[PDB]
Design a protein around this ligand. Structure first.
Ligand SMILES: CC[C@H]1OC(=O)[C@H](C)C(=O)[C@H](C)[C@@H](O[C@@H]2O[C@H](C)C[C@H](N(C)C)[C@H]2O)[C@](C)(OC)C[C@@H](C)C(=O)[C@H](C)[C@H]2N(CCCCn3cnc(-c4cccnc4)c3)C(=O)O[C@]12C
Ligand SMILES: [K+]
Ligand SMILES: [Mg+2]
Ligand SMILES: [Mg+2]
Ligand SMILES: [Mg+2]
Ligand SMILES: [Mg+2]
Ligand SMILES: [Mg+2]
Ligand SMILES: [Mg+2]
Ligand SMILES: [Mg+2]
Ligand SMILES: [Mg+2]
Ligand SMILES: [Mg+2]
Ligand SMILES: [Mg+2]
Ligand SMILES: [Mg+2]
Ligand SMILES: [Mg+2]
Ligand SMILES: [Mg+2]
Ligand SMILES: [Mg+2]
Ligand SMILES: [Mg+2]
Ligand SMILES: [Mg+2]
Ligand SMILES: [Mg+2]
Ligand SMILES: [Mg+2]
Ligand SMILES: [Mg+2]
Ligand SMILES: [Mg+2]
Ligand SMILES: [Mg+2]
Ligand SMILES: [Mg+2]
Ligand SMILES: [Mg+2]
Ligand SMILES: [Mg+2]
Ligand SMILES: [Mg+2]
Ligand SMILES: [Mg+2]
Ligand SMILES: [Mg+2]
Ligand SMILES: [Mg+2]
Ligand SMILES: [Mg+2]
Ligand SMILES: [Mg+2]
Ligand SMILES: [Mg+2]
Ligand SMILES: [Mg+2]
Ligand SMILES: [Mg+2]
Ligand SMILES: [Mg+2]
Ligand SMILES: [Mg+2]
Ligand SMILES: [Mg+2]
Ligand SMILES: [Mg+2]
Ligand SMILES: [Mg+2]
Ligand SMILES: [Mg+2]
Ligand SMILES: [Mg+2]
Ligand SMILES: [Mg+2]
Ligand SMILES: [Mg+2]
Ligand SMILES: [Mg+2]
Ligand SMILES: [Mg+2]
Ligand SMILES: [Mg+2]
Ligand SMILES: [Mg+2]
Ligand SMILES: [Mg+2]
Ligand SMILES: [Mg+2]
Ligand SMILES: [Mg+2]
Ligand SMILES: [Mg+2]
Ligand SMILES: [Mg+2]
Ligand SMILES: [Mg+2]
Ligand SMILES: [Mg+2]
Ligand SMILES: [Mg+2]
Ligand SMILES: [Mg+2]
Ligand SMILES: [Mg+2]
Ligand SMILES: [Mg+2]
Ligand SMILES: [Mg+2]
Ligand SMILES: [Mg+2]
Ligand SMILES: [Mg+2]
Ligand SMILES: [Mg+2]
Ligand SMILES: [Mg+2]
Ligand SMILES: [Mg+2]
Ligand SMILES: [Mg+2]
Ligand SMILES: [Mg+2]
Ligand SMILES: [Mg+2]
Ligand SMILES: [Mg+2]
Ligand SMILES: [Mg+2]
Ligand SMILES: [Mg+2]
Ligand SMILES: [Mg+2]
Ligand SMILES: [Mg+2]
Ligand SMILES: [Mg+2]
Ligand SMILES: [Mg+2]
Ligand SMILES: [Mg+2]
Ligand SMILES: [Mg+2]
Ligand SMILES: [Mg+2]
Ligand SMILES: [Mg+2]
Ligand SMILES: [Mg+2]
Ligand SMILES: [Mg+2]
Ligand SMILES: [Mg+2]
Ligand SMILES: [Mg+2]
Ligand SMILES: [Mg+2]
Ligand SMILES: [Mg+2]
Ligand SMILES: [Mg+2]
Ligand SMILES: [Mg+2]
Ligand SMILES: [Mg+2]
Ligand SMILES: [Mg+2]
Ligand SMILES: [Mg+2]
Ligand SMILES: [Mg+2]
Ligand SMILES: [Mg+2]
Ligand SMILES: [Mg+2]
Ligand SMILES: [Mg+2]
Ligand SMILES: [Mg+2]
Ligand SMILES: [Mg+2]
Ligand SMILES: [Mg+2]
Ligand SMILES: [Mg+2]
Ligand SMILES: [Mg+2]
Ligand SMILES: [Mg+2]
Ligand SMILES: [Mg+2]
Ligand SMILES: [Mg+2]
Ligand SMILES: [Mg+2]
Ligand SMILES: [Mg+2]
Ligand SMILES: [Mg+2]
Ligand SMILES: [Mg+2]
Ligand SMILES: [Mg+2]
Ligand SMILES: [Mg+2]
Ligand SMILES: [Mg+2]
Ligand SMILES: [Mg+2]
Ligand SMILES: [Mg+2]
Ligand SMILES: [Mg+2]
Ligand SMILES: [Mg+2]
Ligand SMILES: [Mg+2]
Ligand SMILES: [Mg+2]
Ligand SMILES: [Mg+2]
Ligand SMILES: [Mg+2]
Ligand SMILES: [Mg+2]
Ligand SMILES: [Mg+2]
Ligand SMILES: [Mg+2]
Ligand SMILES: [Mg+2]
Ligand SMILES: [Mg+2]
Ligand SMILES: [Mg+2]
Ligand SMILES: [Mg+2]
Ligand SMILES: [Mg+2]
Ligand SMILES: [Mg+2]
Ligand SMILES: [Mg+2]
Ligand SMILES: [Mg+2]
Ligand SMILES: [Mg+2]
Ligand SMILES: [Mg+2]
Ligand SMILES: [Mg+2]
Ligand SMILES: [Mg+2]
Ligand SMILES: [Mg+2]
Ligand SMILES: [Mg+2]
Ligand SMILES: [Mg+2]
Ligand SMILES: [Mg+2]
Ligand SMILES: [Mg+2]
Ligand SMILES: [Mg+2]
Ligand SMILES: [Mg+2]
Ligand SMILES: [Mg+2]
Ligand SMILES: [Mg+2]
Ligand SMILES: [Mg+2]
Ligand SMILES: [Mg+2]
Ligand SMILES: [Mg+2]
Ligand SMILES: [Mg+2]
Ligand SMILES: [Mg+2]
Ligand SMILES: [Mg+2]
Ligand SMILES: [Mg+2]
Ligand SMILES: [Mg+2]
Ligand SMILES: [Mg+2]
Ligand SMILES: [Mg+2]
Ligand SMILES: [Mg+2]
Ligand SMILES: [Mg+2]
Ligand SMILES: [Mg+2]
Ligand SMILES: [Mg+2]
Ligand SMILES: [Mg+2]
Ligand SMILES: [Mg+2]
Ligand SMILES: [Mg+2]
Ligand SMILES: [Mg+2]
Ligand SMILES: [Mg+2]
Ligand SMILES: [Mg+2]
Ligand SMILES: [Mg+2]
Ligand SMILES: [Mg+2]
Ligand SMILES: [Mg+2]
Ligand SMILES: [Mg+2]
Lengths: 271, 48
RNA sequence: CACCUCGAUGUCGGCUCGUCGCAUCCUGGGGCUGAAGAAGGUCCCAAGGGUUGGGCUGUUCGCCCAUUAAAGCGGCACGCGA
RNA sequence: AGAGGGUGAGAAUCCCUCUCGCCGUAAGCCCAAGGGUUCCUACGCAAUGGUCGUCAGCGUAGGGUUAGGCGGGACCUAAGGUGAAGCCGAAAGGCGUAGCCGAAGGGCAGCCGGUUAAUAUUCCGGCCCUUCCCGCAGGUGCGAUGGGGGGACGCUCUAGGCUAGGGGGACCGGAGCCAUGGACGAGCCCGGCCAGAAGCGCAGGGUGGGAGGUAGGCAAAUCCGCCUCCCAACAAGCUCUGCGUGGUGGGGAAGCCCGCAACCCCCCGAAGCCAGGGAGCCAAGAAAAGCCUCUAAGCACAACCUGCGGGAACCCGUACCGCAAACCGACACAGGUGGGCGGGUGCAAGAGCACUCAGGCGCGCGGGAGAACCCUCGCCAAGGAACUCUGCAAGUUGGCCCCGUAACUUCGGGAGAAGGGGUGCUCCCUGGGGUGAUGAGCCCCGGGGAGCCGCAGUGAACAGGCUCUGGCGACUGUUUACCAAAAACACAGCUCUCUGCGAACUCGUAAGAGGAGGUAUAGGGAGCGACGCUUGCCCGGUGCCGGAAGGUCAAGGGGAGGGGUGCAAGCCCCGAACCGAAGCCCCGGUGAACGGCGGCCGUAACUAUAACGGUCCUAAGGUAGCGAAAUUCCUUGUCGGGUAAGUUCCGACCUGCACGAAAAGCGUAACGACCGGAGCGCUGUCUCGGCGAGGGACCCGGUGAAAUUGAACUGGCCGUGAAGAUGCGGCCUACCCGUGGCAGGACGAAAAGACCCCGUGGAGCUUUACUGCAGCCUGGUGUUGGCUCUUGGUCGCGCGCGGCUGGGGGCCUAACCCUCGGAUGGGGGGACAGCGCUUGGCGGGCAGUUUGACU
RNA sequence: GGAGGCCCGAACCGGUGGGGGAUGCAAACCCCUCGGAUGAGCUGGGGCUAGGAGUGAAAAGCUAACCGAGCCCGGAGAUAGC
RNA sequence: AGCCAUGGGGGAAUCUGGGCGGACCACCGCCUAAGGCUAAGUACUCCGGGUGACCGAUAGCGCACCAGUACCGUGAGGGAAA
RNA sequence: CCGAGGGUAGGGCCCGUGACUGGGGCGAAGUCGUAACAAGGUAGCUGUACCGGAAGGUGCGGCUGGA
RNA sequence: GUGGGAGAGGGUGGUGGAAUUCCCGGAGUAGCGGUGAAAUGCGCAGAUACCGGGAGGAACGCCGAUGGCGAAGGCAGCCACCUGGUCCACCCGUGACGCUGAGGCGCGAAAGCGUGGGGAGCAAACCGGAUUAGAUACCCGGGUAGUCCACGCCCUAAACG
């Protein structure tokens, strides 16, 4: 959905917040299977290497299951849908018949108290994981492995999905949410359905904090610095680059392709 | 106003400490020097 | 023009304090007047004193308002920032 | 501040007393940090002390700091640090799992009192615990570093009980007091508690109990988790805290000759306790040990467990300062410094404000004058902004309650709009709330009448001036520490763009990392910068994107042909075709990529204009909307409004010097210590100044700087002189020396001018300056391997079989690379990528430099 | 009911205007006045990042009281056609 | 542009070998790489001594002296005087 | 006490009027084009949108009052 | 009320073929395209034409009508569900309970708007090519919103019988 607020304060007058509708009457997160301490840290060993990070509410890291085959043919009951603070997706914490609990990231449609299960013998239904091989062509799927046994790595953002576009024998062709067309291996476990909480895109932060709460520190326009700082910058009394739009480091930032060419990914991608 | 000396024994030992000196081959040479200069104190004195 | 001052002579305007010049704006004396009178004009003699309050502008200046005997002009490091 | 008394050679300054003032969320008390003896005491006063000094934080000396329970450590983990294993680097060394270290975080046993000159939760006293070791009755499957639970968590709001604390009391206890007109009183003054095991109570936290199945928590579990059912269920119980009580132990004032032993009642009452309490919300909120449980190996003659006894219980800190004279500021420096307590009355509240407890101070120079002037402060006739860049400043306003409030609007707002009225005290009647108990005192909100006094009742302190109107910016935010707080940055939001995940990108030589334990609803880069309505045209140039042709194109391949030397085969060199990348050329796309978005003629059945036409140039000629503008030179354009008067302002006109569409265009409610304009209010801003207060200034005693300084015996005017003379000339004037004043001069001081120029000076910065480098691109080649498909050029020879090689298509796996419940392996990639050498290219990201002279 | 980069206002953080200070109490102070004051808040403690490097809600700000390239030592007696 | 060395690529032989004598070739000659050790003659002076047309307390070492101290600096580091 | 009214403040409506501005009306014989009425020489009209010296064009759907 | 009927009436979900466009392969060559004629454009960087494969979106050809349904706007593949209206019959029930309808409420083509998604074809704007005195047009080649979806607005019409 999304909650708008009345404008009893500026920013509040624009700031939509998430519709917590399908958050299983839960709140706190199942410890054990999740969570770890999550090491916040905006730089690396020494130095900032991603600007405008920092601060922002503390998070426990819900440790999710991105390979589902540990639990082949072991059905689990969807214990609950819970909010996971380190993702746009919402985690589904399932109780496995096996006893073991894990959180999967929660596809649209999923419901508390539902059987999901992994494996090639898996019904083609919401939430069940299956190596791509065994998924009906043209089905929407998410949480896709890229290479097999290496973990889900694709579509897992929220209302992200991928279509199986057909097969190349030992492979399979996904329409990644990018719109990219890629050959992915059959053996790669995707999980049926779309990532859900597809409403995420539509939230309006509002106030300039909030962004802050997200650990997203104020970004500053290269042009607005000085030549020491940036390609843009200086020459001042406002100014138009002086061509052509660039990054702090020099490389062009309007349309300059960046994937490297000889990258073995290929004969694997198409558009 | 908040001036530049904000004495903290831990910080002081942690930083100009003798062990501190001996970890960095820089520090080692520092010690080396003060010794050869016959400094009475090789390291900022702090005690607790 | 580049002569003192670049091991510094603070630069506009204002305020404050003046003080000098007179090529006089008033006021005092005069001549001519195309001066009847009262007004003017113009020139001569003469700073003694005087030479307003505002609007606008950083302004100086100036334009305005209201007056006035008049609302003088300059110099003083475009006087005056130990 | 005053005085009195001590002390002393010497006292404004030390001691004592009385009086006075100041603080009282302190300027009092506790704790941390830092400081490191500054603490106590006895002797001292050279120096330190801004004076004094008998005093001291000073000198000499002596003494003082006592812990199982407080804080740290023989506990735990956090970031981080370190670091076996492992990775990487010319060397230094960089990483890095575990582990280890790391605390103000988690864990853990002490409370009240008394004692010292100085220590005290340490010593003493009383009561009450903790852990380790040994031992005995009686009881259990005992046993980890492993397994599990627990620990274990946010923010806002908040309940119920308590407690701390506080307020009364007619009650309990008291030395006493009756002044100065009155009061012998249900008078005044002081005080009416603390701690306390077990048991109790009261409040609250934690907690289903079974039974069986178990493919999970790395086949160890009866533990946990997951299934299932007779019960039980808005509970009881069971533990665990807190608070009462509690055997008992302490304390115990105001007060005099100089020392008599209560302790209760009511109320208010936390932000503290119960505590893992409750609710709501999104931004989703540490770990680990202790603890409990589980089972392993081992072992059950153990071992735990439960008691009860008896033993054992280390190291370190502990004075003192601690918002400051003991810490950071060279100083006994008006600055800076975290946590806790912080009483009472009154003002709506409060940690505000005034006064005041406890407590602590009067700030380590004084005494006098009573000028100018300055500072801070008070008042002011009439005027009321005339001040002035400007209402700068100051004033007015001011709390609360009631009434009442516009445009406009995003609808929340604009609102504290505006603008009024009320405000004390007395007496009378009356409604509800809390606590009691349903009567009652007790606090707590009120309403309704009459009535008193004053100039005045938020009677003192705290306490908005208001309005209209533009500009910029949406907004709260951020900023130039030490001249800028802004219209700058940020900002939600918009667009473009890169990036498929070993992502791009960033840092690093690398390893490694960030990105992200993220995955296109995401991440990077850029610009724009709420929101509204919009964002036109032009891809000639530049950029970027696309383009299996072509052109150019390096190494390399290729060798026609030519050469050097040999008696020689030979050995050497060059060396044409020709095949040979990326890059550039080339083609095309591309504007929220860099950017650009014209000129001259002529034309109205009046004239003035040009909708129309014509023509030149362009890559295309500026659309909408603005528009003498944060832009308009001319300019104070011109009209209009405002004013008595308006270079400003506001509204208009557009010949826009030189707006214009995401270096966004035009608007926009709200917001603004932003910048304009206007008005009311009010004023010492002013006309226009006067008086008055206090700190200085002045005078005396004490202490006593400073920059500056060629030496000075340092006048005015005319001149003169390097062109601005105390210093030359002439003349004038002028006894010698101070003090308070004032600033014209000493081209006064200060800083070897910031401007300016100069120097084959320097740096930051830019780029289509040069030249490099990183980086990326790229051919060849090494690592580098296997089986086929397919087409070439070369000499034979006969377009077909044979040489020799290569190119492209696939495929594979086994190098390399990535991954997978641990691997002599599997899965994915795959001879590609990576990496080495080498080729060319792009290359302000970076670096070194150049960027003439005359004038 | 009790939301909010909501309002007023202490603490606390600030630093707007003015005056004072200007060999200061002070190498940034004082007074009056103003901003924020549940938040992009403030703060103690423990940590990490540094010299063409960091950090930077961006001022070339800050990086130990002067930062368009910190400080120290060294090259070093740089060079100085001044 | 040899020689020596060697990151890359290709890649020998064992004296009918093989390097060298300044591209190269031919003579002529030198020498035997791809393993290692090897005193002495050389350098320096913390340290002991000797000597000086060396200083003589602003000199001489920074220090004649209780100096790498006092003091300054967070620190590296600076650094007296007497 | 109430009270004429006076005063101060703030609103509501109405009239006049205002630089400049928008269109509108009328104007014997103005300029530019020709949109419409005949298939009006691109059927017309239309609501809407966008655009253009202007009529108007074009898109979209619609009516026939068109073929 | 019982029983039946016709129907592009409405909503949701799902599904099928044709065709356009683009993409990959095969083959193949000197033009294709377009018009009144053209030119722009496209094409030896290998287009058009043909074959195969693939992606996607929109509209649903024949049936189709001079037809059907809805109150209107309007509704057309097929399927399923959900649902409105409406007609016939039998004469059963109720027993006037009716008609209209200011206001209100609802619906309301196209275009337009907001937020997301979508985008092949078409196509305002705009871009060129012609034509023309010009040609901001008609014609030609491109081509953005839009056209589609979801939700929310807008509420107009030759909303016409
Ligand atoms: C006296 C206080 C300052 O006053 C002035 O600043 C004065 C107004 C001047 O500026 C003075 C007139 C200048 O001289 C003029 O220079 C011109 C270039 C030419 C003139 N001609 C005479 C040549 C010459 O006189 C100059 C350069 O002073 C800059 C003189 C030169 C000696 C100085 O700069 C001078 C040292 C100034 N300075 C630091 C600079 C101030 C930074 N600061 C500011 N505020 C604080 C501050 C405030 C509060 C607390 N702490 C610090 C610090 C000082 O500490 O002293 C100053 C004089
Ligand atoms: K000068
Ligand atoms: Mg590390
Ligand atoms: Mg490090
Ligand atoms: Mg992409
Ligand atoms: Mg920014
Ligand atoms: Mg800037
Ligand atoms: Mg920098
Ligand atoms: Mg650039
Ligand atoms: Mg640059
Ligand atoms: Mg500019
Ligand atoms: Mg620029
Ligand atoms: Mg210091
Ligand atoms: Mg510490
Ligand atoms: Mg520290
Ligand atoms: Mg000269
Ligand atoms: Mg000359
Ligand atoms: Mg001088
Ligand atoms: Mg004068
Ligand atoms: Mg005269
Ligand atoms: Mg006269
Ligand atoms: Mg006369
Ligand atoms: Mg005069
Ligand atoms: Mg005025
Ligand atoms: Mg002057
Ligand atoms: Mg001055
Ligand atoms: Mg002077
Ligand atoms: Mg008090
Ligand atoms: Mg200490
Ligand atoms: Mg001492
Ligand atoms: Mg004594
Ligand atoms: Mg003394
Ligand atoms: Mg003294
Ligand atoms: Mg003492
Ligand atoms: Mg002493
Ligand atoms: Mg330890
Ligand atoms: Mg540890
Ligand atoms: Mg760690
Ligand atoms: Mg390390
Ligand atoms: Mg601890
Ligand atoms: Mg602790
Ligand atoms: Mg303890
Ligand atoms: Mg004591
Ligand atoms: Mg004891
Ligand atoms: Mg057993
Ligand atoms: Mg555990
Ligand atoms: Mg009594
Ligand atoms: Mg009496
Ligand atoms: Mg009492
Ligand atoms: Mg008590
Ligand atoms: Mg149970
Ligand atoms: Mg096992
Ligand atoms: Mg069992
Ligand atoms: Mg008790
Ligand atoms: Mg008890
Ligand atoms: Mg109570
Ligand atoms: Mg441990
Ligand atoms: Mg055994
Ligand atoms: Mg102690
Ligand atoms: Mg103590
Ligand atoms: Mg304190
Ligand atoms: Mg003092
Ligand atoms: Mg102090
Ligand atoms: Mg001090
Ligand atoms: Mg403080
Ligand atoms: Mg009170
Ligand atoms: Mg109050
Ligand atoms: Mg107070
Ligand atoms: Mg007192
Ligand atoms: Mg007056
Ligand atoms: Mg008066
Ligand atoms: Mg007045
Ligand atoms: Mg004026
Ligand atoms: Mg004036
Ligand atoms: Mg003011
Ligand atoms: Mg009254
Ligand atoms: Mg009274
Ligand atoms: Mg007062
Ligand atoms: Mg204003
Ligand atoms: Mg702002
Ligand atoms: Mg704007
Ligand atoms: Mg600041
Ligand atoms: Mg500043
Ligand atoms: Mg501000
Ligand atoms: Mg991570
Ligand atoms: Mg992005
Ligand atoms: Mg901007
Ligand atoms: Mg803007
Ligand atoms: Mg082009
Ligand atoms: Mg262009
Ligand atoms: Mg181009
Ligand atoms: Mg290219
Ligand atoms: Mg060649
Ligand atoms: Mg090429
Ligand atoms: Mg544009
Ligand atoms: Mg245009
Ligand atoms: Mg204009
Ligand atoms: Mg004007
Ligand atoms: Mg302009
Ligand atoms: Mg007028
Ligand atoms: Mg005017
Ligand atoms: Mg003015
Ligand atoms: Mg104007
Ligand atoms: Mg502009
Ligand atoms: Mg632009
Ligand atoms: Mg504007
Ligand atoms: Mg505005
Ligand atoms: Mg603000
Ligand atoms: Mg502001
Ligand atoms: Mg005055
Ligand atoms: Mg006075
Ligand atoms: Mg006085
Ligand atoms: Mg004296
Ligand atoms: Mg004399
Ligand atoms: Mg002279
Ligand atoms: Mg003379
Ligand atoms: Mg003489
Ligand atoms: Mg004097
Ligand atoms: Mg003077
Ligand atoms: Mg003076
Ligand atoms: Mg001077
Ligand atoms: Mg100079
Ligand atoms: Mg450069
Ligand atoms: Mg050089
Ligand atoms: Mg020159
Ligand atoms: Mg010249
Ligand atoms: Mg409500
Ligand atoms: Mg607020
Ligand atoms: Mg505010
Ligand atoms: Mg201030
Ligand atoms: Mg300021
Ligand atoms: Mg001042
Ligand atoms: Mg404030
Ligand atoms: Mg406030
Ligand atoms: Mg926060
Ligand atoms: Mg902190
Ligand atoms: Mg600094
Ligand atoms: Mg420097
Ligand atoms: Mg540097
Ligand atoms: Mg530099
Ligand atoms: Mg040198
Ligand atoms: Mg050799
Ligand atoms: Mg050789
Ligand atoms: Mg030779
Ligand atoms: Mg040897
Ligand atoms: Mg010797
Ligand atoms: Mg000797
Ligand atoms: Mg010496
Ligand atoms: Mg001597
Ligand atoms: Mg010396
Ligand atoms: Mg030190
Ligand atoms: Mg009336
Ligand atoms: Mg027509
Ligand atoms: Mg026509
Ligand atoms: Mg027609
Ligand atoms: Mg139309
Ligand atoms: Mg058109
Ligand atoms: Mg093809
Ligand atoms: Mg009947
Ligand atoms: Mg009806
Ligand atoms: Mg539509
Ligand atoms: Mg739309
Ligand atoms: Mg067309
Ligand atoms: Mg409609
Ligand atoms: Mg019809």
């Amino acid at each position: 959905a999304v909650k708008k607020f009345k404008p009893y304060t500026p920013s509040r007058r624009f700031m939509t917040v998430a519709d917590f509708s399908e958050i299983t009457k839960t709140e706190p997160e199942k410890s054990l299977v999740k969570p770890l301490k999550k090491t916040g840290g905006r730089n690396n060993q020494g130095r900032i290497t991603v600007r405008f990070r920092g601060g922002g509410h503390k998070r426990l890291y819900r440790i999710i299951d991105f390979k589902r085959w540990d639990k082949v043919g072991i059905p689990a009951k969807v214990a609950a849908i819970e909010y996971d603070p380190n993702r746009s997706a919402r985690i589904a914490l399932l109780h496995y018949v096996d006893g073991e609990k894990r959180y999967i990231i929660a596809p649209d449609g999923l419901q508390v108290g539902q059987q999901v299960v992994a494996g090639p013998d898996a019904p083609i239904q919401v939430g069940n994981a299956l190596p791509l091989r065994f998924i009906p062509v043209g089905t929407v799927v998410h949480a896709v492995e890229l290479e097999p046994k290496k973990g889900a790595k694709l579509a897992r953002a929220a209302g992200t999905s991928a279509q199986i576009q057909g097969r190349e024998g030992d492979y399979v062709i996904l329409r990644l949410p990018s719109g990219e067309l890629r050959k992915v291996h059959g053996e790669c476990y995707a999980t049926v359905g779309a990532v859900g909480n597809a409403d995420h895109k539509n939230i309006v932060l509002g106030k300039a904090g909030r962004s802050r709460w997200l650990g997203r520190r104020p970004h500053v326009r290269g042009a607005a610095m000085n030549p020491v700082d940036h390609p843009h910058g200086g020459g001042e009394g406002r100014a138009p680059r002086g061509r052509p739009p660039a990054s702090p480091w020099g490389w062009q930032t309007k349309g300059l392709k960046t994937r490297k060419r000889r990258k073995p990914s290929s004969r694997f991608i198409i558009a | 106003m908040k001036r530049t000396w904000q004495p903290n024994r831990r910080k002081r030992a942690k930083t100009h400490g003798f062990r501190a000196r001996m970890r960095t081959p820089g520090g080692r040479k520092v010690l080396k020097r003060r010794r050869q200069k016959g400094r009475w104190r090789l390291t900022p004195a702090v005690r607790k």
